[model samples]
Target: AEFVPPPECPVFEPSWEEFTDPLSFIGRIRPLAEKTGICKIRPPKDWQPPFACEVKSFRFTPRVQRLNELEAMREYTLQSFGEMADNFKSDYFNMPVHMVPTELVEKEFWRLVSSIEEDVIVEYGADISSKDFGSGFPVKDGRRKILPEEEEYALSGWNLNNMPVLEQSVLAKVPWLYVGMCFSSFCWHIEDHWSYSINYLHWGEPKTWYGVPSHAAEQLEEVMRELAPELFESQPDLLHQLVTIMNPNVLMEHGVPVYRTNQCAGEFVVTFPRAYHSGFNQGYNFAEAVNFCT
Candidate 1:
């Protein structure tokens, strides 16, 4: 099915000049969003990466499913893909993607879809680390090729291919390559050490994202604590692991502003430090994301 974004989630189109301030909150960018240094990368004409590895090489453990709205709300604490599956009765379980309105899907994403009786299989960075996959995004070879203002960013010094310090740092060096089909998702969480992240969707279906500003980070945590006290109390580490998934509607209900966007192939999404964001793929797609601290 073609991708469609919820109406509530507006896309931000910023000029390179407007986006120069890295500290400013730019919720989400549309496919047309652009900047001087930012450019789209595409696969060679009619060519795509092959997934020759055994399917078992990339398997995701499905979180326990929750039945009923009350059970869904109560067990929201269970960390896994369970929240999305149980909250929305869609293609994840062979239901048509359009059966539910995109808006409702966003609002009840955590409450409606509960369990997929089947195992979820995915190929991600952890699985392809040993293989040779290079980033399709181009990087300037020399400092002279880069803009002076861009050079001022702390991220400039941490280019993995050029900087030994970043090469040695686990957070910056390792780029996660994600191969996802419909319903395969990344739960909400922030980067390690409160860093920024640059994600590129190399090719395929658009990936949707919901973001929360850094200022409301505490508010999000507080709301989560109220919604699922048991999960927070029993498993404090779960949040750090990026295991928990919740609807942005719930966050906004508690007065935390949330932003949304759908990132298509050849586009980039830059997440600011400590922004709480989460989303799922619309269909088969490949993407790479890396963390950096400024």
Candidate 2:
């Protein structure tokens, strides 16, 4: 009858010794992190990468999303978008941004998005996928760079960037830049071919995530299908349509295990192959992510 939160997902805090190599550290945690389907990793305190973007100079149009399935927005530079984020949050909460408790915001986000009469909207700076927007994630030396300072991180050995190109064609492991606002959600969906995805919160407010392990993928689909058999009647590419706003609690009740965790600024959330995950941003924030296949 009521919402029940899922168990917290695995989180790892690695030291300099354990975190030296991105791919190696991922391999080290594979056994445990794989069990929950998604894990949060916080590197050594001294290893924060420099945030490399000019807020004032960089700007782009955003894709605004309304919970019902889908809003208008002007081109916003990082600086302006951030300012709007703070103001929108303060006005909506009717309290100072700092005073709005994290737990409260989390609950309010879920509550607001779930209400039919109330339609709160949020936007994500996603899907401008070819290139250019791929800053924030690690980059190579000769690729297109908005600025030289973006040359500030390392490429994980497992990233598709390391994959050899065939004359037949294959490329663009472009990391998508995400600028999020309060109540804005990145919906429930898994990567194509069940590839793994890793997201890095470059700065700003924390983002929370819910995940269902790869092993339970079918079970979740079964539960969804039963809940709305009518919806499934017109399906085949339902997953491709990115359908559904299922509450994790609903899955738990139907016997599908779900896990969740909060990802703070400078943290990384890695979703394992075939794992289904989704979540809403706590407030305004920026994150970069990419998909890689093994």
Candidate 3:
């Protein structure tokens, strides 16, 4: 997250921006140029996917711990949020809203509920809590499990055959990696192996990403591990946060820049991978994004 990627990657803007001059502010972020210059492109309003191409995709829900009937889960989630500290660590840098799928715990939902009931009886001397009607969600355990086989199959790089529109735009079925999620936040890191990525912020207002090229991955990781005393020694969570907040790559001393945009219900923002970036929800609500790579 320490580096900010240049405009070498592609980015998409809406109609208002697109209808403007090609040299205008928005035209530069159009799809064709992105594809030609960088590894990815964000398509404009009039942009269309090519024929005979397909898109592979995957969808998953965040882990929620709260349950309408389980007052214990609600208390647990709230407690976790309340006790949160900036000392969190992980391979991928991320800060997510307490609610939504990020904190879901289907596997541990019933188990934690049982533990809470037992604790209440022992600590409070009785089960003073009643059944909660909140949506049963999960706790943030700080681990990202691999997608299921079915999901991987659905979103495989080979699924381009299904996306005719995408194929037409690029004139070829670009190999892509796609992911769609609701109200989910991501850790600051490059895309898989540092390939190009297009992130279409469909339904949320997230901050701009400051990304570095994959070439810098090793050096940056080493610097954080060895010399940056103020940064995270173990994994550099600060670096991730910094990259998200400031463009570390382009504006090293400045951090990642925040490019704010209001992508309405039918709008999106796209960019490539290795672009150091991170973001938070505008409010305590849900947002969605669709990502693809060629």
**Can you write out model 3's per-residue Cα lDDT over 1-294, one digit (the tens) per residue?**
212223333444435444333224323454453332222223454432211111121122223312222233222222232222111211112444323232222212223323445431101001111112111111111222223433432332222222222312455522322111221223345444444443333222232333344444465555444433333455445444333221133234333232322232223344444544443232222222223433
Query: What lDDT score is found at residue 185 in candidate 3?
Result: 29
Cα lDDT listed for each candidate: 0.50, 0.73, 0.30
Q: What is the lDDT of residue 106 in candidate 2?
A: 69
Which candidate order results from sorting by lDDT in descending order?
2, 1, 3
True-vs-predicted CA distance for residue 123, candidate 3, Å: 27
Best TM-score among the predictions, by candidate number = 2
Give model 2's clash tally: 1
Lowest summed lDDT window (length 10), candidate 1? 34-43
Task: Give the candidate number with the greatest lDDT.
Answer: 2
- Clashes within 3 Å, all models in order: 11, 1, 52
lDDT of 1 at 158: 22
Give the Cα-based TM-score of candidate 1 against the true structure. Answer: 0.56
